[PDB]
Amino acid sequence: YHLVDDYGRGNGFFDKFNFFTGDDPTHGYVDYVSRDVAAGAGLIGERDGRTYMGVDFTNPASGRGRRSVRLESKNTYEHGLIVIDLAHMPGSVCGTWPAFWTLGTGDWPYGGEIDIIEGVNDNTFNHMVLHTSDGCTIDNDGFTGNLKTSNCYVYAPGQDANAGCGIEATDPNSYGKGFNSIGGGIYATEITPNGISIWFFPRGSEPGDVLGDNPNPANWDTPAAKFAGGGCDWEGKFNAQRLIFDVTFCGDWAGNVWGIGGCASRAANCVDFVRDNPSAFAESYWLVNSLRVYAP
Ligand SMILES: OC[C@H]1O[C@@H](O[C@H]2[C@H](O)[C@@H](O)[C@H](O)O[C@@H]2CO)[C@H](O)[C@@H](O)[C@@H]1O
Ligand SMILES: OC[C@H]1O[C@@H](O)[C@H](O)[C@@H](O)[C@@H]1O
């Protein structure tokens, strides 16, 4: 692998993304704002060299939701290695639904979708998921995570609508609260015509070449999640992928599972909570040390 795109930091970093302002596709109680508004609301910026991207934790919400940002990269990649080093990620905050993921070109889910970092509410473990068109199942081996669903098809017969094929990390510091308590870590995602692999290196355990110019995933520890096998035409299920950063609220996942999890005691429903308790979302922010993409 050789470097092809270093996102840098601060404004140079944001220059490489488009700010999504449309209604939330996942129907969350969120108000995605433009770059200027976000900048004017302290939603984006730099923090001691780290790139900051958060949500409104000051004002009571109104309109379509609590303000946040959803960044989608201008550049796209189809084969390569995506390495993100985070000092902080949106916390395990009730009502929130953060995600660092990739989305293919064309109509979803035909171009494929890779959720590298995702979770909802007070989740402890991270979920790594693939969302694809029909005809793509993965094998159960080659990774340290716990396999939940093996059919990547968004409307797979035996799984919840759009659960996709998901693998749950076993390290409680792989997401939100625990992740932030150790100062974060690194998530490396490899896309090849033979499958996808995702490695999570908690702060201090990353290999010597992961942040360098010529990383070689071949000599690394077993990945946390691996999607491969003859049950999928890996090449055809995924096309050029663009990177996406976002934090939504409630909606199809977080909002739907609000009443059965540990947040049910915060309020009758997710929206009421997110609307009236701004101070609860102070931890809902990303803090990027670096974002680099490589190619074979
Ligand atoms: O992971 C199990 C969980 O899946 C939920 O569907 C989510 C999916 O997990 C997520 O990766 C994707 O981005 O959004 C879909 C739709 O919200 C499902 O709603 C849950 O019931 C299920 O427990
Ligand atoms: O934003 C990417 C896609 O995400 C999916 O979860 C939504 O259902 C689609 O409508 C949307 O196009």
Side-chain angles (χ1 to χ4, degrees):
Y1 288 96
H2 50 74
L3 177 73
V4 291
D5 210 3
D6 190 311
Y7 283 66
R9 81 186 69 165
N11 294 317
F13 177 92
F14 299 127
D15 290 346
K16 301 169 68 63
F17 288 90
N18 289 306
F19 281 59
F20 178 87
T21 49
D23 291 354
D24 182 33
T26 51
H27 316 104
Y29 183 63
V30 70
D31 182 19
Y32 288 129
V33 300
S34 66
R35 176 169 174 174
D36 295 325
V37 170
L43 262 42
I44 63 179
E46 233 179 291
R47 299 292 181 272
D48 297 291
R50 284 79 66 78
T51 300
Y52 174 98
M53 301 178 278
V55 313
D56 184 328
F57 69 100
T58 292
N59 320 103
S62 69
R64 52 180 185 178
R66 178 158 293 291
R67 298 183 307 170
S68 175
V69 290
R70 167 165 168 160
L71 293 67
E72 306 191 359
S73 64
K74 304 186 178 180
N75 285 174
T76 61
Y77 324 90
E78 90 149 319
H79 288 321
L81 179 71
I82 307 166
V83 185
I84 190 169
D85 185 340
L86 291 170
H88 195 285
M89 87 162 268
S92 296
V93 177
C94 283
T96 69
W97 181 357
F100 171 59
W101 51 302
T102 76
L103 172 55
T105 70
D107 294 331
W108 178 82
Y110 294 103
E113 176 187 316
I114 310 178
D115 301 310
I116 300 172
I117 299 178
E118 180 183 29
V120 295
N121 307 314
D122 69 347
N123 275 359
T124 286
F125 306 99
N126 174 59
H127 312 73
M128 297 156 276
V129 206
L130 307 202
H131 290 269
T132 72
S133 56
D134 198 12
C136 186
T137 63
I138 61 169
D139 298 327
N140 178 38
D141 76 89
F143 55 93
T144 68
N146 289 305
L147 172 66
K148 324 315 313 325
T149 40
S150 66
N151 195 328
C152 310
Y153 178 39
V154 295
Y155 306 133
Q159 318 167 346
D160 284 323
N162 190 43
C165 54
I167 295 181
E168 188 184 76
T170 56
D171 186 328
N173 297 315
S174 71
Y175 179 89
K177 184 157 127 181
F179 179 94
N180 294 321
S181 71
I182 66 168
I186 299 175
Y187 268 91
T189 301
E190 178 186 49
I191 307 165
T192 80
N194 284 172
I196 300 160
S197 300
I198 297 168
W199 290 264
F200 163 53
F201 300 118
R203 181 64 57 206
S205 69
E206 68 274 20
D209 68 338
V210 71
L211 300 174
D213 294 310
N214 304 88
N216 176 31
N219 293 337
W220 295 345
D221 276 25
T222 300
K226 180 144 133 69
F227 314 86
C232 186
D233 165 27
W234 298 107
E235 183 55 44
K237 282 293 177 290
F238 302 75
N239 51 36
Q241 303 291 304
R242 74 200 188 247
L243 321 176
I244 298 176
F245 279 100
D246 80 60
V247 180
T248 186
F249 298 92
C250 309
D252 294 359
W253 188 3
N256 191 63
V257 307
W258 174 275
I260 53 79
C263 302
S265 73
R266 316 300 294 281
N269 56 250
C270 184
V271 180
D272 284 308
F273 186 74
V274 173
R275 183 190 61 235
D276 315 328
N277 304 278
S279 73
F281 308 103
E283 285 302 292
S284 304
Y285 67 91
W286 313 84
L287 211 58
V288 189
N289 277 149
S290 73
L291 175 56
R292 296 163 191 150
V293 183
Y294 306 78

